[PDB]
Amino acid sequence: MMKLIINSLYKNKEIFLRELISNASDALDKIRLISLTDENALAGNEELTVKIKCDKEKNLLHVTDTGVGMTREELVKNLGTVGFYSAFLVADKVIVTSKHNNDTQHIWESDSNEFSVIADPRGNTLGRGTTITLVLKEEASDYLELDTIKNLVKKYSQFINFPIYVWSSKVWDWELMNDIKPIWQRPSKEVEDDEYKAFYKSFSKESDDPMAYIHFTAEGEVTFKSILFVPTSAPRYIKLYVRRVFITDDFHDMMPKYLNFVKGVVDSDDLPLNVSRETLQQHKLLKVIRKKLVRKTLDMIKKIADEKYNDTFWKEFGTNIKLGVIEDHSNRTRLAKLLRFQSSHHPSDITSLDQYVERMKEKQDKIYFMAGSSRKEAESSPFVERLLKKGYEVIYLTEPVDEYCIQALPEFDGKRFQNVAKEGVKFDESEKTKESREAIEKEFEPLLNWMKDKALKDKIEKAVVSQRLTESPCALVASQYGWSGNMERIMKAQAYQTGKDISTNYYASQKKTFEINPRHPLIKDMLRRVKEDEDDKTVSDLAVVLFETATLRSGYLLPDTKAYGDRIERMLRLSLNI
Amino acid sequence: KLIINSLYKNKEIFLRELISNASDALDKIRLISLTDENALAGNEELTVKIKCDKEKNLLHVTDTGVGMTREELVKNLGTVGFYSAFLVADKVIVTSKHNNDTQHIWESDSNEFSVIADPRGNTLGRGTTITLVLKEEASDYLELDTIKNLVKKYSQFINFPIYVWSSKTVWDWELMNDIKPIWQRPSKEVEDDEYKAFYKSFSKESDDPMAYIHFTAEGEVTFKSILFVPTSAYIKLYVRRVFITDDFHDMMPKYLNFVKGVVDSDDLPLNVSRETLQQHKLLKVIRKKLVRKTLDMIKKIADEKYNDTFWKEFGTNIKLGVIEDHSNRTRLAKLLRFQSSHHPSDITSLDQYVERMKEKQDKIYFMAGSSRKEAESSPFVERLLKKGYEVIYLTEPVDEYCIQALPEFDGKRFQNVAKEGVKFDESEKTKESREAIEKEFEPLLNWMKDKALKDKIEKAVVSQRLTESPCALVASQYGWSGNMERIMKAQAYQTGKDISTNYYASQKKTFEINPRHPLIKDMLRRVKEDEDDKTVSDLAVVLFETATLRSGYLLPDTKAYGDRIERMLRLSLNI
Numbered sequence A: 001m002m003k004l005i006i007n008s009l010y011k012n013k014e015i016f017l018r019e020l021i022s023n024a025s026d027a028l029d030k031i032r033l034i035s036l037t038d039e040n041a042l043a044g045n046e047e048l049t050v051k052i053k054c055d056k057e058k059n060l061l062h063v064t065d066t067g068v069g070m071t072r073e074e075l076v077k078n079l080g081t082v083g084f085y086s087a088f089l090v091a092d093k094v095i096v097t098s099k100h101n102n103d104t105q106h107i108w109e110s111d112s113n114e115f116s117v118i119a120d121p122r123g124n125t126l127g128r129g130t131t132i133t134l135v136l137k138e139e140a141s142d143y144l145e146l147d148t149i150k151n152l153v154k155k156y157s158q159f160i161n162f163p164i165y166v167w168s169s170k171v172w173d174w175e176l177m178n179d180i181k182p183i184w185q186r187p188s189k190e191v192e193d194d195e196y197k198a199f200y201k202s203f204s205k206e207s208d209d210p211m212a213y214i215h216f217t218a219e220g221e222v223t224f225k226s227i228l229f230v231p232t233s234a235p236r237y238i239k240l241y242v243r244r245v246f247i248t249d250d251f252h253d254m255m256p257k258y259l260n261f262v263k264g265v266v267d268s269d270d271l272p273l274n275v276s277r278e279t280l281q282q283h284k285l286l287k288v289i290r291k292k293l294v295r296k297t298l299d300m301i302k303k304i305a306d307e308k309y310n311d312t313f314w315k316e317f318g319t320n321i322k323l324g325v326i327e328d329h330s331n332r333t334r335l336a337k338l339l340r341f342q343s344s345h346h347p348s349d350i351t352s353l354d355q356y357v358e359r360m361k362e363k364q365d366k367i368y369f370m371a372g373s374s375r376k377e378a379e380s381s382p383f384v385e386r387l388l389k390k391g392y393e394v395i396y397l398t399e400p401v402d403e404y405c406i407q408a409l410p411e412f413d414g415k416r417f418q419n420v421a422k423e424g425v426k427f428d429e430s431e432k433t434k435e436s437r438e439a440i441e442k443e444f445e446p447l448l449n450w451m452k453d454k455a456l457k458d459k460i461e462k463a464v465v466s467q468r469l470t471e472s473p474c475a476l477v478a479s480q481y482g483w484s485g486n487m488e489r490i491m492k493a494q495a496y497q498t499g500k501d502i503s504t505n506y507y508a509s510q511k512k513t514f515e516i517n518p519r520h521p522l523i524k525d526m527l528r529r530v531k532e533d534e535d536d537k538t539v540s541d542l543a544v545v546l547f548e549t550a551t552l553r554s555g556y557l558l559p560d561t562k563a564y565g566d567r568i569e570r571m572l573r574l575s576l577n578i
Numbered sequence B: 001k002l003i004i005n006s007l008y009k010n011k012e013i014f015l016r017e018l019i020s021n022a023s024d025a026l027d028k029i030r031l032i033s034l035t036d037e038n039a040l041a042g043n044e045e046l047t048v049k050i051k052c053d054k055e056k057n058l059l060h061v062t063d064t065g066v067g068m069t070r071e072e073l074v075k076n077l078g079t080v081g082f083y084s085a086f087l088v089a090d091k092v093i094v095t096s097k098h099n100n101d102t103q104h105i106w107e108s109d110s111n112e113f114s115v116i117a118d119p120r121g122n123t124l125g126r127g128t129t130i131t132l133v134l135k136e137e138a139s140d141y142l143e144l145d146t147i148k149n150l151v152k153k154y155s156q157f158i159n160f161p162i163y164v165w166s167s168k169t170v171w172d173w174e175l176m177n178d179i180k181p182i183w184q185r186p187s188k189e190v191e192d193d194e195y196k197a198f199y200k201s202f203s204k205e206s207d208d209p210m211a212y213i214h215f216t217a218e219g220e221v222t223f224k225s226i227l228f229v230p231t232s233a234y235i236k237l238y239v240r241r242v243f244i245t246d247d248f249h250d251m252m253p254k255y256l257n258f259v260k261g262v263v264d265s266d267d268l269p270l271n272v273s274r275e276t277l278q279q280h281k282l283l284k285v286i287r288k289k290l291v292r293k294t295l296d297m298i299k300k301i302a303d304e305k306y307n308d309t310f311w312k313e314f315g316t317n318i319k320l321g322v323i324e325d326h327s328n329r330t331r332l333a334k335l336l337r338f339q340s341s342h343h344p345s346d347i348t349s350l351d352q353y354v355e356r357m358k359e360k361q362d363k364i365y366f367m368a369g370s371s372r373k374e375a376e377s378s379p380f381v382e383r384l385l386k387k388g389y390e391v392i393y394l395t396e397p398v399d400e401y402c403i404q405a406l407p408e409f410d411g412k413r414f415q416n417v418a419k420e421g422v423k424f425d426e427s428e429k430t431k432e433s434r435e436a437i438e439k440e441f442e443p444l445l446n447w448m449k450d451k452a453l454k455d456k457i458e459k460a461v462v463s464q465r466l467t468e469s470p471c472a473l474v475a476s477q478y479g480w481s482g483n484m485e486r487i488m489k490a491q492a493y494q495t496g497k498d499i500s501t502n503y504y505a506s507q508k509k510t511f512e513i514n515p516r517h518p519l520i521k522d523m524l525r526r527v528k529e530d531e532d533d534k535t536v537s538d539l540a541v542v543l544f545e546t547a548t549l550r551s552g553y554l555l556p557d558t559k560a561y562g563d564r565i566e567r568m569l570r571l572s573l574n575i
């Protein structure tokens, strides 16, 4: 898009200046950074400033910085291959006078297409820096006013930490337009809400408010002031200053990987200023600063209003909190309180763990969960039937990270987690219920022994009477430390996309505990016809099909769909005549 | 203090690491001299001079390389490598002169150290001398007979002159080294064992390379190169025989990142910057020639070895190659291997599939699965197999993508058996017989479309691809199959999210039925008797839900499926 930018930004026509001030300030950051390890880098031009002149006589607008500038080699690359082209929205011809420490002064000219670089016939005028000169077009020929620049600078120079002067009448002399003092250095009581929002937009754009922000000052082992932000959306970051001097935004180990979405500034008066980037990154004080940034980020996330947290924060950054529980051992408890999940308590609303706890029964000491690939799968599962009926709430885990997240959290507020698809599910039992159960177990013993010893031999660990089923005839339960259906699934996907066929593992190719419902009509009939004739194949063929459907119902992959299907066929044939 | 009596087996390797280091220092100062004329001021020469001393019990390894500054001496020297010098000595004296600093002396007694300015001052001009005060238990190294064979043993591929202090019965330096590079020699004269020894000199891998190629490039650019294929999953750039770098990451395309070798060009600029030389026009011409010659090498590998060994290791690289490299796609397509229904385990080439194709067969049929077993027991391939058509099986994630980037092989288009478009030719007697049976089952076709499976299927038709299977779900040509439903939705669940309202995930499929199948015949038989019957209603849904799993898709509602199954199980027992 050559000339297809002028019309798409006819709204933001005045931003040409903001884009130039931005560039000037960046150039000033770079040379100031070089001078921290080179005592005579400022020798060409002592001051670090932004100067703007209106040359209405010649139709020129001058933006002069005393920054790093550009070399002969840098002029042909950087100025060619928003941004710098923003100048062409108000200028037909663009000329930049520039002087770098490692080369002589040159003048770069361009209409918009081709280019040419010549040495400035005047010699070295700036000493160091760059002057952006714009041959201002007809409709833009009004910026060269004694108040237009004055007012535009005073709104687009906000948050520029270098002094900006304009050549003005009063005698023609420079006049300071901005305030050099950083807003992160100002006390919180004085900084307005709009100012914090405007700051967020100034270094990340997007023209929408941050989700949240925190402005703090640190006391103790290390001293620094900081402003941190939570963006409104997960993008699909942190600027470090030492004694008010910009150093870098390339330090990625500032925040742990789970809090990578956080944006902001850190200004430390304790870090070494007159040192290299490699030395500062591995500095011991940085690890202290980091621990403080994480805690203050979590303070900020915690402060988000209840509804907004669930409806907005959780939706974008819930996974990050889940990864946080796994990574951040020292902040685990704070993070566990930030977790939100779906549960049987409501069809869609998410719940905290504290809210789950408050809803618990007096003698319930396990936080129950069902892990699936979708809510629907998890909620229509055979394992939640009795729990739900008797009023136990079950958390539903529908993302693959969820199970590693729970698996990394031994307890929550004195309560241990229990996977309903696994051994360890308990119901408080009255003496009447308890005894009525023991009678059932003995009544169904000839069916349990038949299933284990012949019908389903070498398929199941054992066959028992279940206490977790309502509507379902049977289900497959994994051992307490074994793999569930959801884990088998997650692992098989991982072993296919990356792994080298982990078929003969340990607790992957193992048999499960086959639990039956003594009140289900079909199991009742099955007990009857087995005691009469144990070698009745019609019952034996029916046990296999029932077991294989339980496999699917339980969340496990079927070992051979061809055979299963062929059984279903035979069943359907002897269910009619076909 | 756990290396002295173990590292031894390789016990005399202290010299190899010291020769290697000297050569690196020599390589580095020469690299600086290309842009800087004042680099070789202290010394004009670039040598390695080893010297023996019986009386003082000292062994000096002297180089005229870059040298080390005082700051570097403290950091670099200390904790394979430089430490190996403590296997034969218990005190290493390092004298070093660098262009940016005065001459210093570093000494270490394996534990502690010290670094002071040399009392003698500048005696080296530029470089380092490593003095070894040998142990009296392993001081055999100061013997002329021993040192002469030891330097030749570890300087075969060192391209700087190595000298030793010797005499003829007149003391002077002698050359134990031929600095003409292996790549610059004529291809005929270089022995096979020399190419192998060269591979281990820079890879430090011990084992042989799987394959190698040594060629001289001609035409648009001229260079000499030796490229290697390793046995299990870095290119050195030289200009005018002068080492430049090995940090040019894009020398080879990403798919061929396993290739190791050297490139020596007399057409590239020498006295220029690394940044500049990386973007030079001739380098891209070299890059294109490296790929083609690499592929030439991969093609020269014998048949069995290719499938048994190359394919097992780098097969995935070739598949990624077909996708990445548009220019060499046709060359790469011929390197692809897949399993097929021709043999239970053997993999086949596409040319081999083509040679087996039927007279008037225009398509290469493929079935994609999570494993071979699901692919080979798919309803989709039933009649193709029976009629003698071969089906390629795609059991890996990349496969789907690989074939997709290949619009044709040798004039043939690929056909997914899970998708509409499988062809079976027929005579007028077969075409009319089909059109008769098709109109015979049409009442059932509309009953399944408008009653039984009203909003679950796109259309119900009579299949020509089944033998044993009663039915199957067939995908649209512009739709997703079962395997692609996975690949996509096991990444929307894994990474993506909110893909319920996707492109075509909740899209209905074509429900094909087998007219010769007992259950489909008796379903047609009973569809005219009542129709309002809930037994055939259940029969058809249960069969449709079983066809789904059987077709590679997933069951909408598993519970409802279970509930159906058990009502049928009620009939088969209590009745």
Ligand SMILES: Nc1ncnc2c1ncn2[C@@H]1O[C@H](COP(=O)(O)OP(=O)(O)NP(=O)(O)O)[C@@H](O)[C@H]1O
Binding pocket: A019, A022, A023, A024, A026, A027, A065, A067, A068, A069, A070, A078, A079, A082, A083, A084, A085, A129, A130
């Ligand atoms: N005043 C200046 N002094 C020195 N170099 C400059 C100046 N203005 C522009 N440049 C060079 O031109 C390049 C592009 O500038 P610009 O198009 O504004 O993008 P940017 O500032 O790098 N990033 P953005 O903030 O998105 O515009 C910069 O990387 C500089 O190297």
Ligand SMILES: Nc1ncnc2c1ncn2[C@@H]1O[C@H](COP(=O)(O)OP(=O)(O)NP(=O)(O)O)[C@@H](O)[C@H]1O
Binding pocket: B017, B020, B021, B022, B024, B025, B063, B065, B066, B067, B068, B076, B077, B080, B081, B082, B083, B128
């Ligand atoms: N003769 C020498 N001249 C200049 N520098 C040297 C010399 N010998 C060793 N060094 C320095 O000491 C460092 C450590 O050497 P060494 O322990 O052999 O590892 P390395 O040379 O970096 N790589 P490698 O030898 O493959 O393990 C090197 O990085 C060199 O900078």
Ligand SMILES: [Mg+2]
Binding pocket: A019, A022, A023, A083, A084
């Ligand atoms: Mg910019």
Ligand SMILES: [Mg+2]
Binding pocket: A566, A569, B468, B469
């Ligand atoms: Mg069958």
Ligand SMILES: [Mg+2]
Binding pocket: B016, B017, B018, B020, B021, B080, B081, B082
């Ligand atoms: Mg070494």
Ligand SMILES: [Mg+2]
Binding pocket: A471, B563
């Ligand atoms: Mg039921």
